[PDB]
Write a protein that binds this ligand. Structure first.
Ligand code: 77B
Length: 251
C-alpha cells in the first residue's frame, strides 16, 4: 500500500468524493457518513452518479438504525441500503433528486452567515414520495447495496478496503478540543467527552512524521479544513479504527 492515498484524486470521475455536506441541527452523523460513502461507492462501482438521500436514510430506516436525529448506528445504516435501498436527494433547498435534505444548514462551532446550529432537532417524517416534478417514483428511485460489512480494527485492512473499494464510514469519540479543529493532524489532549460521531474516511497520509486518516466531516465547508480534517492513524485514537463499516452496491 502507498504511503498516502486520497480517494478524491484516485477517482476523479466521482465528484461526490470531494463533497462536504451539512447535517444541520440534528444528530444524523450516522446517516451522513453512510450516504456520503455510499454515493462515492455507487460511482466507483458502476463507472452512474447519485447524490444519495440523507433524508431517506435519516427518516425511513427506523429502529434498525437507531433513533434518527437522536443518533444511530453506522452498520445499521448500510443494512438499510441493502434491505430497503436509498433514493436520491441533494442538499437542503437544492431541489436535486427524489428527497433533498429537509434540515437547514447552520454554523457548527464557527461564525458565519448562516444561523448557529442548535442541537435540538426533530427527526423528519419518513415520506415515501419524491419532490414535485421529479421522476421516477420513490420506489423506482431506490438504489440497493448488495452487501453490508464491518472492517476489523486493523490499520492495514482499513487502508486496503479504502484503496480497493473506496471511502468507508467510521466513528470516533468527540471531545471538545476537536470542535475547534482548523488544520494539522488532530490528537485529543483536552475537553469533555461530547459523544460518538460518525464520519467518512477517504484516505490517509503523513504530516510532519505523523500518520493520519483523511476525513470528511458533515458540518459544512466553513468548519475545519474546508469541511475535512485529519486525525491520528495507527493507534485507534479516540476509537477512529474501532467501528469501520462499508458495503458494495448491487451489480
Ligand atoms: C453523531 C452526531 O450527529 N453528532 C453531532 C450532533 C449534531 C447535532 C445534534 C447532536 C449531535 O450523535 C450522532 C450519532 O449518530 N451518535 C451515535 C450515538 O451516540 N447513539 C446512537 C444510539 C443512541 C446513542 C448512544 O448513546 O449510543 C451509544 C452506543 C455505542 C455503541 C453501541 C451501542 C450504543 C454514535 C453511536 C455514532 C458513532
Amino acid at each position: 500500500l502507498p504511503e498516502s492515498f486520497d480517494a478524491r484524486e484516485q477517482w476523479p470521475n466521482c465528484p461526490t468524493i470531494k463533497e462536504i455536506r451539512d447535517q444541520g441541527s440534528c444528530g444524523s452523523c450516522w446517516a451522513f457518513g453512510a450516504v456520503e460513502a455510499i454515493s462515492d461507492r455507487i460511482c466507483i462501482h458502476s463507472n452512474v452518479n447519485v447524490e444519495v438521500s440523507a433524508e431517506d436514510m435519516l427518516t425511513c430506516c427506523g429502529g434498525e438504525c437507531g433513533d434518527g436525529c437522536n443518533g444511530g448506528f453506522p452498520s445499521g445504516a448500510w443494512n438499510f441500503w441493502t434491505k430497503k435501498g436509498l433514493v436520491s436527494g441533494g442538499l437542503y433547498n437544492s431541489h436535486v433528486g427524489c428527497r433533498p435534505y429537509s434540515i437547514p444548514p447552520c454554523e457548527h462551532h464557527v461564525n458565519g452567515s448562516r444561523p448557529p446550529c442548535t442541537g435540538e432537532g426533530d427527526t423528519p417524517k419518513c415520506s415515501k414520495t419524491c419532490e414535485p416534478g421529479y421522476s421516477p417514483s420513490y420506489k423506482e428511485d431506490k438504489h440497493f447495496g448488495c452487501s453490508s460489512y464491518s472492517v476489523a480494527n486493523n490499520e492495514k485492512e482499513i487502508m486496503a478496503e479504502i484503496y480497493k473499494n473506496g471511502p468507508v464510514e467510521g466513528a470516533f469519540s468527540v471531545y471538545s478540543d476537536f470542535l475547534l479543529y482548523k488544520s494539522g493532524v488532530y490528537q485529543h489532549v483536552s475537553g469533555e467527552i461530547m459523544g460518538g460521531h460518525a464520519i467518512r474516511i477517504l484516505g490517509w497520509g503523513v504530516e510532519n512524521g505523523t500518520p493520519y486518516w483523511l476525513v470528511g466531516n458533515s458540518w459544512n465547508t466553513d468548519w475545519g479544513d474546508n469541511g475535512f480534517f485529519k486525525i491520528l492513524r495507527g493507534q485507534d485514537h479516540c476509537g477512529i479504527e474501532s467501528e469501520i463499516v462499508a458495503g458494495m452496491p448491487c451489480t
